[PDB]
Design a protein around this ligand. Structure first.
Ligand SMILES: Cc1cc(C(=O)N2CCN(C(c3ccccc3)c3ccccc3)CC2)ccc1[N+](=O)[O-]
Ligand SMILES: Cc1cc(C(=O)N2CCN(C(c3ccccc3)c3ccccc3)CC2)ccc1[N+](=O)[O-]
Ligand SMILES: [Zn+2]
Length: 988
């Protein structure tokens, strides 16, 4: 094993310019931590040796912006645009298609920037390490790359100098879109006001109104000050040998540098002598909600340095006990009181900054209740200090942590490096964050030695703490219009200030940029894997289907789950009256939360938290593999637990199926409003998903149901329900739904657990199935399709697809665009071609047109299992032009002007996605949900391998050409005059 070999490292070992400083076994995480420092530069290194073939690298820099230009964010984009060893244009995006990576990306936190990738191929790992090391340490930082990624002045027509100058840039629009999320606005201001004395007071990602203040020289200087290895933390994880990583890192990068003392320290925030208050504004919601019904207020407290790890562990658990779930004191005082709709953003513990902070409050407050909310926060703090916490809640909490520690995920390295970053950033010891057994033991010991331990902590940090911030936010109906006018003004000033020489240089550089964006260039300097590096076959999944409780099929899959059990049940929707369909998602979200039998909603929540890692239900439409107009509909019941709590888990499922408390009217109203609030808040962030779902709604029977379940129709339905004065007519629908769903008449189940736990599990499941009820479909055409377990699917053989174009009028500064095209299902031989084509179009055409030229944050094409080919954009400054580029993309595809190497790279990209690691808990789910056998997946795999140039041009013409297939279109974004005057567009 890797972690055992790492145990052979000794203190003082010299390896490729590094010295081993510490070797620590962490058996609760099955890993050995190795701490090293690079001798000449002093750069810190952490290697986590573990038997995991999905290896990860990251490099981290302490980046401390002193303004809101977004320079660290823009620099992060720009270093990926070309480097000394890989000077060609855009090494990073190109490597995405020359790799079998499981993850490739970068991001910018408030005061650090992190560059991680992961892969299961050791040669791929070396390739990516070289590209990453060169980008970060020796970037070209070309002026025009900065103009593309950051901001620039550009003529509306770059080759016409008589057209007006406008602002453009990828990050420019990226941040406009980020702050389309009003929770993100609140969150940004909270941090800026609470920590006003240094870097944390600015908008690290870039305030859109300040971004055009960034100059090329400021960008280069910021790299010089922060991208030195003495200011870096290097991280690797997995079973690939450490020696090779260290060799590259020293020889490629670190050997070129000497040690410095980086001018990058973040000083401590000096604590306030008295509390502060501030008021801010945000955008209106999408539903023209009255601003006096939409107030957010929160109260935040400054906490100690996160580098004091045990105190940080204490405060984190404390914050959870205060705010998590319907038994927490703040939930009870604030949420169940009906004072708001949900917690305010960043509720709980925030430890990404040098000093952590706790925050609590509400959104959805009527302005008149604001002073009551503030009062209740204070009163709740006083009560907790006096009474402390329930013992069984503390046990539930430690159980919750145990489940996190034991659960096996497929991206453990990515999770770990993100997790330790802020602590490491301020010279903390990341290894102490891995020693969870120690932290827990000391926490338990503190509780035992001092019965008022947590009460004392609450008094010290929440009652006596003068560094307290009250922040309130109210929507402004012209928030973004006001932003745009300020920008229009700023733009005008910039432009009128230009000399004739400036205007000429802006014109020439713009044409030079467009040229660089257009002219095909050689990428041979870049490393690459080959298609022959892709595995020919996949490891078979061993499962065992057992008919149980009579005729109910249960799928058993033995896996290394580390003492965890994962249970799923799938119950058909085929007998439910179709009028109840829209209410199934609501039914699903409250089913495990209203109480069951003798446990009221509070008792049930406590049991669920003490005995499980979660219990949920969700509605699903599962498209058939061979027929576009056939699907399966049902509800998925899902849960997980430790081995020893399996019986308790199934006891909960039994009571939930048999006696859910649908008379719980008051907690029901609370959940409805929480859900509606959260759905509305999530629209911008998933803007393109909402567009795609609307656009596909008229293309297949399933698409129509999917919009009902999770489209804008569903968000709107929840919003209406949440505003009703009498929710009784809705609540009375829940029993009608239970009648058709909560029984074993049309059910199948799955179990994932260790082989030695399987026997106990079969018993517990069979008992559950015998405890729920037993003894014709609403749709006239249903088909039985056996699995290579017989699924009963709906088919609508008279379904005819039709075209629709919908514009959702949204108070957004950017757009979200979707165009869906009906093409064949998964088992159709043309499907593999279309899948390759999607990635090809994305890489070769759409990314450049929509993002690089347009300045949209994202633009591409994808193909779903259902056979819907989707073209989309995300945070897009343009709507009509994007729709035009969708069309030109299909013309390009039809033209066949892509090479064999382009096709090979599209294959690499696609296989890097479909061969991504599956967790032990999820093995066999392709079979369970979609009825996809290994023989089907392998046939699909061979079709993907066989995809050729002539096949690609053929399917481009056959399905994507004009008039060949049915299209659907949708946009979320502000008013567009051209669209408003086109009668083929429905405005919503
Ligand atoms: C700094 C930070 C990091 C994380 C984080 O990455 N995770 C993921 C890992 N997870 C670890 C953990 C869970 C419970 C108790 C202690 C630590 C974790 C989970 C599983 C394995 C190893 C660590 C904590 C949350 C979340 C929030 C914050 N923060 O707000 O300050
Ligand atoms: C209670 C809880 C918390 C967290 C969590 O977010 N963190 C993030 C912060 N993290 C702190 C920490 C972990 C290990 C050792 C010491 C502290 C922490 C990590 C980095 C900076 C500041 C605090 C604790 C867990 C995740 C899950 C659970 N849970 O299981 O209910
Ligand atoms: Zn970005």
């Amino acid at each position: 094993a890797a972690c055992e070999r790492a145990l052979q490292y000794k203190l003082g070992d010299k390896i490729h310019g590094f010295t081993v400083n510490q070797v620590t076994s962490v058996p609760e995480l099955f890993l050995t931590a190795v701490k090293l420092t690079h001798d000449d530069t002093g750069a810190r290194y952490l290697h986590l040796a573990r038997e995991d073939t999905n290896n990860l690298f990251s490099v981290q820099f302490r980046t401390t912006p002193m303004d809101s230009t977004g320079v660290p964010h823009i620099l992060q984009h720009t270093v990926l645009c070309g480097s000394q060893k890989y000077p060609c244009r855009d090494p990073f995006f190109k490597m995405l298609n020359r790799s079998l990576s499981t993850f490739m990306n970068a991001f910018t936190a408030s005061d650090y920037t992190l560059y991680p990738f992961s892969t299961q191929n050791p040669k791929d790992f070396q390739n990516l390490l070289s590209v990453y090391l060169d980008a970060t340490f020796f970037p070209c930082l070309r002026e025009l790359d900065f103009w593309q990624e950051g901001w620039r002045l550009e003529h509306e027509n770059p080759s016409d100098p008589q057209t007006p100058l406008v602002f453009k840039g990828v990050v420019f629009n990226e941040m406009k879109g980020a702050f389309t999320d009003n929770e993100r606005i609140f969150s940004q201001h909270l941090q800026n006001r609470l920590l006003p004395d240094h870097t944390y007071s600015v908008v690290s990602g870039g305030d859109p109104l300040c971004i055009p203040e960034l100059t090329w020289e400021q960008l280069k200087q910021f790299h010089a000050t922060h991208y030195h290895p003495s200011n870096a933390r290097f991280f690797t994880y997995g079973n690939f040998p450490l020696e090779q990583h260290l060799k590259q890192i020293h020889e490629e990068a670190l050997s070129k540098f000497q040690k410095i003392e980086p001018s990058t320290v973040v000083p401590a925030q000096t604590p306030w002598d008295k509390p502060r208050e501030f008021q801010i504004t945000c955008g209106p919601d999408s539903f023209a909600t009255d601003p006096s019904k939409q107030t957010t207020v929160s109260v935040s407290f400054l906490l100690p340095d996160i580098t004091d790890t045990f105190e940080a562990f204490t405060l984190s658990l404390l914050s959870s006990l205060l705010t998590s779930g319907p038994n927490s004191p703040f939930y009870k005082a604030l949420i169940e009181s009906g004072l708001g709709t949900d917690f305010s953003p960043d509720v709980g513990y925030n430890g990404y900054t040098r000093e952590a902070y706790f925050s609590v409050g509400l959104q959805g407050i009527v302005e008149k209740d604001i002073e009551t909310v503030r009062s209740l926060i204070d009163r709740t703090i006083d009560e907790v200090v006096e009474k402390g916490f329930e013992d069984d809640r503390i046990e539930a909490l430690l159980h919750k942590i145990e489940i996190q520690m034991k659960h096996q995920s497929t991206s453990f390295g990515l999770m770990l490096t993100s997790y330790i970053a802020s602590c490491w950033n301020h010279d903390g010891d990341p290894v102490e964050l891995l020693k969870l057994g120690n932290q827990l033991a000391k926490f338990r010991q503190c509780l035992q030695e001092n019965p008022k331990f947590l009460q004392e902590k609450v008094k010290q940090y929440f009652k006596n703490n003068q560094h307290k911030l009250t922040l309130s936010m109210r929507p402004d109906d012209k928030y973004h219009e006001k932003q745009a006018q300020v920008e229009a003004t700023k733009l005008k000033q910039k432009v009128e200030a230009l000399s004739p020489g400036d205007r000429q240089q802006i014109y020439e550089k713009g044409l030079e940029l467009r040229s660089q964006q257009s002219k095909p260039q050689d990428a041979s300097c870049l490393p690459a894997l080959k298609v022959s590096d892709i595995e020919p076959t996949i490891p078979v999944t061993e499962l065992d289907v057992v008919l149980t409780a009579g005729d109910i099929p249960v799928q058993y899959c033995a896996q290394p789950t580390n003492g965890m059990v994962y249970f799923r049940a799938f119950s058909s929707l085929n007998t439910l009256p179709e009028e109840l369909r829209p209410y199934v998602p609501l039914f699903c979200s409250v089913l495990t939360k209203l109480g069951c039998g003798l446990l009221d909603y509070r008792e049930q929540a406590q049991q669920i938290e003490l005995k499980t890692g979660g219990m949920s239900a969700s509605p699903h439409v599962l498209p058939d593999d061979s027929h576009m107009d056939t699907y399966e509909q049902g509800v998925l019941f899902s849960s997980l637990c430790l081995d020893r709590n399996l019986p308790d888990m199934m006891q909960l499922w039994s009571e939930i199926f048999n006696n859910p408390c649908f008379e719980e009217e008051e907690h029901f109203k609370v959940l409805v409003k929480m859900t509606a609030q959260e759905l509305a808040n999530g629209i911008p962030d998933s803007g393109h998903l909402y567009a795609s779902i609307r656009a596909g709604r008229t293309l297949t029977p399933a698409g129509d149901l999917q919009e009902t379940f999770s489209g804008m129709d569903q968000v709107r339905l929840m919003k209406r329900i949440a505003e009703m004065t009498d929710i009784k007519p809705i609540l009375r629908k829940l029993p009608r739904i239970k009648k058709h769903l909560l029984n074993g008449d049309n059910m199948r189940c799955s179990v994932n657990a260790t082989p030695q736990q399987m026997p106990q599990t079969e018993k517990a499941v069979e008992d559950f199935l015998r405890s729920i009820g037993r003894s014709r479909p609403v749709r006239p055409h249903t088909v039985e399709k056996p699995v290579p377990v017989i699924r009963k699917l709906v088919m609508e053989p008279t379904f005819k697809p039709w075209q629709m174009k919908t514009h959702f009028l949204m108070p957004f500064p950017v757009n979200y665009v979707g165009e869906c095209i009906r093409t064949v299902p998964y088992t159709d031989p043309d499907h593999a071609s279309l899948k390759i084509l999607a990635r090809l179009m994305t890489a070769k055409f759409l990314h450049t047109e929509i993002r690089e030229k347009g300045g949209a944050y994202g633009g591409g094409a994808k193909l779903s299992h259902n056979g819907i080919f989707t073209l989309y954009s995300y945070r897009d400054p343009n709507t009509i032009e994007t729709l035009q580029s969708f069309g030109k993309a299909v013309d390009w595809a039809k033209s066949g002007k892509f090479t064999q190497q382009d096709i090979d790279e599209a294959k690499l990209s696609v296989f890097s996605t479909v061969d991504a690691p599956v967790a032990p808990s999820d093995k066999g789910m392709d079979h369970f949900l979609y009825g996809l056998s290994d023989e089907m997946k392998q046939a699909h795999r061979e079709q993907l391998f066989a995809v050729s140039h002539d096949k690609l041009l053929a399917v481009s013409d056959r399905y994507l050409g004009t008039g060949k297939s049915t299209h659907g279109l949708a946009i979320l974004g502000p008013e567009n005059p051209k669209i408003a005057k086109d009668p083929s567009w429905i405005i919503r």
